[PDB]
Amino acid sequence: SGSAQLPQEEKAKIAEQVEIFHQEKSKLDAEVAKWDDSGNDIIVLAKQMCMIMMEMTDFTRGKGPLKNTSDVINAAKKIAEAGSRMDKLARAVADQCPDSACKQDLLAYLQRIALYCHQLNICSKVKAEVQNLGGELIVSGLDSATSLIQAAKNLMNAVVLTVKASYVASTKYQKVYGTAAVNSPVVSWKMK
Amino acid sequence: SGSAQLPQEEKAKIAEQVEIFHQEKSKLDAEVAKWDDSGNDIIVLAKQMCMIMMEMTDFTRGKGPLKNTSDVINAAKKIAEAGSRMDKLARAVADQCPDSACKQDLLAYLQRIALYCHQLNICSKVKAEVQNLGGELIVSGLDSATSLIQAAKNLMNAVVLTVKASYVASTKYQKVYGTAAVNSPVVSWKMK
């Protein structure tokens, strides 16, 4: 034996946070659906980050390929690696951008991505523990899954904003320097 | 919120293992009650090991001064330090012993103490965790407290045997070499 289901209250709070997460995920799907991700690794990395975040939130609902805390920790580290790669590419977009306010916006969103990848790493431990409290041995940390989902939602939101700001910064470069700029855009935005 | 009581089944299995532990602890109390522990640090260390094991088993019943897993881990490390000190002293008793079979017995019980201190260190983590199993997020490891109590019971039993074998080895030294042996017994066994 040795196992028990989460209290029904906790299962309810989880399905509630997962719904909020799914609404942020829809924003990313809508944004990414416009573009052909050939020649745009920011889109590819965003889709990969999104897919892994879906695995992590599915874990909290008893779904998907992640079975234990170790898998969830490894998923968070993969998200962080992808965010590190998106960061390097979007930094080059921002450097190429001729508008200082679009550039600053984009760089600030990248710092948000770094912070939220780190916070997702922290929450991926989904810690439970026993403690001696109130004259009983109790199991604490049962709401850790909810912190995980909210950290995923925060990261999803920053990825959405970063993808949009990368597009905006790209169009400023082309508007100013033309489609005939000698240096090609770091990333291309072609419709689907 | 965030916390829940252990399933009543688990609370029952814990009170059952604690009872078995208490019977081994009684054997130590009976053995230690005979002796004045002045001049006998094997007795002192055994009492200290016993007292800390009582704190650890009390933790599983919602009693005593240990409140969280970190306290229980620290308690196990204190037990291991005391066992290391008892080991050095009882080794000197065994070295002084003129009967090779009592000496071997005693040294073998000391290796049992080392093994059971190590196993108690492992069990003191009393690990809980969530996992994605059977289409649900469940809490596993709720029987970890039972492994902790049994590891304490194993160590208690080896301490009882070690105290007895230290006494036996001491009396062989005095029987053979007399109360006028030029080298005094490593440890003294005086009645109370």
Author numbering:
A (entry chain A), B (entry chain A): 670 to 861
Wording from the paper:
The cadherin-catenin cell adhesion complex is the major building block of AJs, and has a crucial function in the dynamic behaviors of epithelial cells, such as cell polarization and cell rearrangements. The structure of α-catenin (100 kDa) consists of three distinct domains. The C-terminal actin-binding domain (ABD) (28 kDa), which is connected to the rest by a flexible P-linker region28 (2 kDa), directly binds to F-actin, and closely resembles the vinculin ABD (vin-ABD). The direct interaction between α-catenin and F-actin was demonstrated to be a catch bond, an interaction that is stabilized by increased force.
To assess whether the α1-helix affects the α-catenin-F-actin interaction, we performed in vitro actin cosedimentation assays with three ABD variants of αE- and αN-catenin (αE-catenin residue numbers are shown): a wild type form of ABD (ABD-WT; residues 652-906), an ABD with a structure-guided helix-1 mutation (H1) designed to unfold α1-helix (ABD-H1; RAIM670-673GSGS), and an ABD with a partially deleted α1-helix (ABD-Δα1; residues 671-906). We observed a nearly two-fold increase in the cosedimented amount of either ABD-H1 or ABD-Δα1 compared to ABD-WT. To examine the structural details of αcat-ABD with enhanced F-actin binding, we determined crystal structures of αNcat-ABD-H1. The dimer interface involves L807N of the βH, which mimics M673N of α1-helix interacting with the hydrophobic patch in the αNcat-ABD-WT structure. Moreover, the observation of αNcat-ABD-H1 dimerization, which occludes 3100 Å2 of solvent-accessible surface, in two distinct crystal forms provides a basis for further examining the physiological relevance of this ABD-dimer interface. In addition, we performed chemical shift (CS)-based Rosetta comparative modeling (CM)48 to show that V796N of αNcat-ABD-WT remained in the cryptic state, whereas αNcat-ABD-H1 displayed a large conformational change that exposed V796N on the surface, resembling V796 in the crystal structure of αEcat-ABD-WT. It involves the βH motif forming an extensive dimer interface with the hydrophobic patch uncovered by α1-helix unfolding.
